[PDB]
Amino acid sequence: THDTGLDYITYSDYELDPANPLAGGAAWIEGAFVPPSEARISIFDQGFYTSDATYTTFHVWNGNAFRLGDHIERLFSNAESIRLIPPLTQDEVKEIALELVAKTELREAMVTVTITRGYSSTPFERDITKHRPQVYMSACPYQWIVPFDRIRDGVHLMVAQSVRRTPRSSIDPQVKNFQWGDLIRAIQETHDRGFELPLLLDCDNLLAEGPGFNVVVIKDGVVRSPGRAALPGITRKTVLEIAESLGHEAILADITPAELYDADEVLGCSTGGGVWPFVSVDGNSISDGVPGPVTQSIIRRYWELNVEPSSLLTPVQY
Amino acid sequence: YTHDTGLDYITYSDYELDPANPLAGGAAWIEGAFVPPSEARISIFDQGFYTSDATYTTFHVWNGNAFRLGDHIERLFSNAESIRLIPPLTQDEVKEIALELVAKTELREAMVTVTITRGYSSTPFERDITKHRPQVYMSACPYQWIVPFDRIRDGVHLMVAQSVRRTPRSSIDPQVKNFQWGDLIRAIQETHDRGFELPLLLDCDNLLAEGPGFNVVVIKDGVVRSPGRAALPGITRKTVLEIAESLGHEAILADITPAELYDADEVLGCSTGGGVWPFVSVDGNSISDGVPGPVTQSIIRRYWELNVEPSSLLTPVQY
Amino acid sequence: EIVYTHDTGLDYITYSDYELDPANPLAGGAAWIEGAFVPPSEARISIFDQGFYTSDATYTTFHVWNGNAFRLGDHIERLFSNAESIRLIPPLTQDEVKEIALELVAKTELREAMVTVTITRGYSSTPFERDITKHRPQVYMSACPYQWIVPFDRIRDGVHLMVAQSVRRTPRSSIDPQVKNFQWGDLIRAIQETHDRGFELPLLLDCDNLLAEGPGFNVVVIKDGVVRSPGRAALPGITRKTVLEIAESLGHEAILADITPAELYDADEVLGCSTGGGVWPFVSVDGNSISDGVPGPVTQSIIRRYWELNVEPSSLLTPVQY
Amino acid sequence: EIVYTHDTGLDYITYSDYELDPANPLAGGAAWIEGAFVPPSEARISIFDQGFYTSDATYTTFHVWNGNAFRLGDHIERLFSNAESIRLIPPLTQDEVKEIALELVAKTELREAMVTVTITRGYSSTPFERDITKHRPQVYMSACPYQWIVPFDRIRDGVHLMVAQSVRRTPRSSIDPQVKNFQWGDLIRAIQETHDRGFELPLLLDCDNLLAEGPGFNVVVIKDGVVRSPGRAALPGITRKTVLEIAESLGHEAILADITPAELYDADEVLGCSTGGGVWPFVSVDGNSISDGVPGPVTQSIIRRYWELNVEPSSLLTPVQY
Ligand SMILES: *[C@@H](CC(=O)c1ccc(Br)cc1)c1c(COP(=O)([O-])[O-])cnc(C)c1O
């Protein structure tokens, strides 16, 4: 829990049971519910040594899971893209994940579901029937990519020059993955040059995405986000739906660096922190330099959707 | 842990594993402890897993001797430096621990992996770089063969991948050994679809790159060439080019076109995982007369001699 | 002997019935160069024009059918936009270009024609010029008989497509395909590969292995009643624009998108489009049949409607004053 | 009026002392087009030549200094090799090309000159021609006064380099930089960026973010006595070849290699080279000084030796018969 300093983001008023060994954090590994200190996987799992895996991360707020159906549908689609047959159904995954959160007692949480090729085979296996895929889960306190004061005041963005986003013809960014070699290089560049977060470009020098977040660009009342070298984010989807509710045209598109610098407003979005403003790029102010009014309406409406009763929410049974 | 090979130049050791030893035939070193394979586990909160923020190397032991251990650990530490990772052990400390690990398994023929990660005490968004706490993990297992023995003798059928290309140096550098195999796995899958044995990937410029776990070498008019850019600087590759120079051939790193691959006199593959083997066809097209060439055969034999003949390439394991 | 008409064997494509005046030295073909209307044999440019030796130029090609120019306004707007993208200031206005081009066609007496308008950086300057004010851009035009990228029997029966493997479309970060240009090094390589492998036309892929375009044409892919065409590594074609408008009028969702090779092979229908020939079907890819290997019904209705739009009085048509 | 000599301010570069005959209509500049020797104002080509509208062509540019052609054999060999790479069969032999080119220079009376030889696919066919035998390739030549990519004072004092960020060199998988070509879309963008950011010349990177080349020149990087130049995304320059030979003669290791931006910034010395100006220093990159910001000693000895090779009797020189 925290006091946020923002009227639209609150936190539950509760205390964790110290008699419960899973309280405040836990994992599900090979059929067992375990505490964080016992949450370990085999070094012989291909999910480690060939990163042969995909995943998704959903969140729980005030005791409700946000867009669980969308999340598990994306996970299973991503698994299909890499020819991975999950050993559980979508319904089974949902039930186990919700149970895991319940055992932690966490009302505000992050829940990761990972599917790997497993430890019963190697990448050179001739017989595809010999592969034995694994599912791993973890539930932890909600994590913030940017702090609360920066959600209010905005963040300073940098366009990376020493690295570009991996092409779809090598390792597809539309498949959520742990292969962050390029994304880590971008973070390191950000430390060197003295900025807060990086945005990468693609092979054609068009806007891609950042480490753990999508970017959105607002110009003359039109709301645009990168369609190609970017994860199809659930937060992004929500942002574009909100934009349409407010009477704006909202579309996926190819966006140039010139268009980024010349934008009315710019924002970032992710399951890990929700929505926040980007007020400058490479030290150049975006319209002056303070969070724009369309961005502010979007941020407020997003957090309303986390609490107002709808089909977007699934109650956790504690 | 042993085989009859059917080849005069590859011979396993004649011995038996002690069944009273719980580490016999396989073991790992994890967070200061020597453990059996079933207890060899790492934290899911290690960044080496969830951001693949790690590098590694794999060396081998043959007839009780580690092969080119110094070169291997030098490459590992160089790769760590390339990704700004400060190892928590020295090169000497790593060598001593790795050799002890093998000794405890009693394996005379083995594969030994040394991995360095960013660790589990921090996250990718950490503001203070001093807060990172890197980890070292090791494992020792029986020697593994990327191709079987009959195929080392008779040759392998290669495929040039069309649905995927090797990750560029401007995204994830192939010259840093890494676990980020998304492209390499796609290539293996394409090989199953099209009915071939192993794949070779191309780079962004449609020049020869490398394969999943191996380098490629191309021989034409007595000149021996291997890809210099989109390829790991292999220790086996290095040995192959040294052997070629010994035999009086010009041996160089270079940019190689697909046309040059199809028109080659000889083609071979190399890796710590299996040594050296011939590639006798590409996309169903024969390389020369479709049988292993004579320069390839001399290289294969000489490689295995170097694994047994007493030299500075060898380091004895104290069993 | 200039060929300027044909019997097509198709009820929806009909040439005009007329004769060229042999007393006219510009009849059947002509050019506009440095203020002068000239015959083809005198249609020459300076080797010192940067439009040649650095290919520092852009262009467009429109057509005339049964005495009417098709979508002239859209064509000249795209040309001027393409010029702006490469920082080239045209020495004529859009209106002036339209007037000169229409006159040129009139002088040829051609009722069915292809008209190319080219803008170059010129011959008064070099690429290393320090003072940008010293550049003196040039406009060149030519008008010729209508040309067909594919023959009439293939418009009816369909064409055999090949996906290129030895070459890829130049990236937007080097030479932008969204700017019409003469820099065809990649496209010519693709054509040569089609001769090697024994196919009729090539389709190139982009850096991400997504569908791009072909030499002188855009590609369109139809699946479960949805009509899609490549948005990135492709010229914003005027024929493409017309095809998508027609699809919407038939009640289909019609969009620009990123399209995979798997999707191409698994398509219900595939077609090609260009000013140079209109619209035609692609019935196989790499020797694999698309559906049952015959032109699909959505494609057929698009082809027929396209040619109807070339004759039915609309704002898409501009009459030539012969 | 025609400028054909200068006082250079440099002891190692000296023009010839002579006067052009004003009775000669080809004096000071001329071209060879379709079998005819013509003056610059009549030097024109057909707009229907594919060398224009599909840039389906390759070329080379050699120079003449103090009445001798420099490395003519190497130049014509590269030209014929480049033609072969794009499946273009030249309509003249290498000997015929040499003889015609030398005659052309002789007719201009120029002792210091630039000579361009171009081979195109021609005007007797189109890119869609089914029968390869129907292609009729053309050769075009021009001879002009020697041209300087950088002025004399900058050869002495050095040039300010910029690494381009808005554009990258066309990949070998689209349009090959190892085939000399007129397809300069990326190179022109780089020049434009140089005007925007306030620098003198640009250097482009390749797809892997490694050093490529510049517009009309190769780059060379010197570090701890080792001399290196980009091997992949770069023309195999004749000037580059000469520079590396000179480096070996001075006792330096001289090699083609993959070079990173970090290595460029950290270099002891950096230089540029081309037929169009010879050799010159690069003293800063993106406003950052290379070493102490003045031309390095290895660079200076290379520059001087290059110009010695242009005058000292050797097999590198072919005399023009005036
Ligand atoms: C390393 C691949 C291996 O080390 C390995 C080990 C066991 C097996 Br069954 C398969 C592969 C590798 C190389 C080889 O370089 P070196 O000879 O080990 O120094 C080459 N290229 C890639 C991409 C690799 O991963």
Ligand SMILES: *[C@@H](CC(=O)c1ccc(Br)cc1)c1c(COP(=O)([O-])[O-])cnc(C)c1O
């Ligand atoms: C334009 C190509 C042509 O206009 C053309 C003209 C005549 C012939 Br015989 C062949 C080609 C082009 C397009 C499509 O242009 P639009 O649909 O007519 O506006 C698409 N892609 C490329 C690369 C082109 O050059």
Ligand SMILES: *[C@@H](CC(=O)c1ccc(Br)cc1)c1c(COP(=O)([O-])[O-])cnc(C)c1O
């Ligand atoms: C060749 C460029 C030239 O030939 C040239 C001639 C005159 C002028 Br003012 C400018 C340029 C070129 C090279 C260098 O090749 P070489 O050393 O002359 O054999 C390198 N890279 C490119 C892209 C070129 O065009």
Ligand SMILES: *[C@H](CC(=O)c1ccc(Br)cc1)c1c(COP(=O)([O-])[O-])cnc(C)c1O
């Ligand atoms: C995944 C982002 C996360 O799941 C995540 C988890 C914890 C933290 Br502290 C930060 C981020 C991801 C996204 C997110 O899109 P979505 O809105 O969660 O669907 C976007 N882009 C990339 C590359 C990601 O990895």
